[PDB]
Amino acid sequence: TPDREKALELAVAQIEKSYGKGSVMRLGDEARQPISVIPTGSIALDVALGIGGLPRGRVIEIYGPESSGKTTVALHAVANAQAAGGVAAFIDAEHALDPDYAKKLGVDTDSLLVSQPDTGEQALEIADMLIRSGALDIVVIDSVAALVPRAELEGEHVGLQARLMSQALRKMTGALNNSGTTAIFINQLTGGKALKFYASVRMDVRRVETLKDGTNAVGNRTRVKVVKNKCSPPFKQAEFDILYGKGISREGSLIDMGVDQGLIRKSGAWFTYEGEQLGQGKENARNFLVENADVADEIEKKIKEKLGIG
Structure with missing residues (x-):
């Protein structure tokens, strides 16, 4: 108890020194509160993340089934960054974004930079260029699955989409940390086994049940689990409502x-x-x-x- 508590403190201290702030935590710990975070749109999720929102300067993964709510969560992050005077970018290989919906939940779509890249390489390269500018508070990548490699698109083995991501992230991580820009990667199911390790936060979004007034369907009770969190004890879980046409x-x-x-x-x-x-x-x-x-x-x-x- 007495002699042990100091050897353990020492061990933790070494681990923070050697590998970084969130390298080891007790699940009962209080989170180090940063200066600024990007709120999520739900106080529930903000609390579940510990630090009151998404971290700045980090990689973030938000995954889940199609129409799970993940994109909605990403758009709120976009809106809240803009509302704090920030500038936003959306790298789009899915071609699914609804701007009127985005407008309704708070996004300044007019100001929103958007790019519809020709290849996976280009998508990540362009992100990296925006990131190194220093001008961006947030950039969103929709989606990891869609980041198809030039070679494959040009008809030319398979397995190098992972290598592409891995390479891109190694390069991108330093750039995000310096700039303080937050990078949100949206993901289905896969393709991001690199992403799983590079991401400071990982969120598992799913629809729980369907909200309604009578016969007509109003929205969805959404559930998010913070499966990975380098900025506060992980495995925290949140529920909130996403209302059709309105958002969270x-x-x-x-x-x-x-x-x-x-x-x-x-x-x-x-x-x-x-x-x-x-x-x-x-x-x-x-x-x-x-x-x-x-x-x-x-x-x-x-x-x-x-x-x-x-």
Whole structure:
């Protein structure tokens, strides 16, 4: 107990020195809070990440099935970076982006730099050029699976898509760290076995169940597991709502997390905050919080303070 605690401290200290800050952690530890993070759009996920958002200057992977919510999560990261005066880029080999949807959830699409590269090499090369400029807060790659190698596209064995990624990342990691630019790689299922090791954060996004008012389908309860996290204890998990045409329900995540923390009491169906009533249904509480941004900010501020998130 007594002589051991110092030998263990020493061991951890060496490991941080030799390999870097997050190289080893107890799962019960409090996260080192950075100066600035890129919030995700859900306080739930922000908390699950420890540091209140995605880290700057790092590689991030967000994977999951098609239409899982991963792209939505990436777009919010884009919107929040822009809203903080940042500049954004979207490297697109999927050709699936819906700008009106992006517009609706907060993205300044007009300002958004977009590139539709001819090959995987070019896609990563262009990203690297944007990154080394120093001008970007965030760049998104949609997607890893689509980063097809020139050789394959030119009709010319297979197995070098992995080599391509591996090479690109070795080069890109230093560039991101210096610039402080965040790189989000979206992924299906694969192709990124390099990505798994280079990524500081990995997020597993999935649809849990389908939200609805009656017969008509309004949205999706989404679930994210932070399977890898070099900036705070990993394996944390979050749930939030993605509403068709609207995106992540910030207000719905403030409520969920509000009651999670005791800031919002739930006497019956009624949701309560500081003696005042927010709504009878969860929707009413959600809707109340959209109509009253002041209180929604007030609640958000209280959740950050109680959990220590700058």
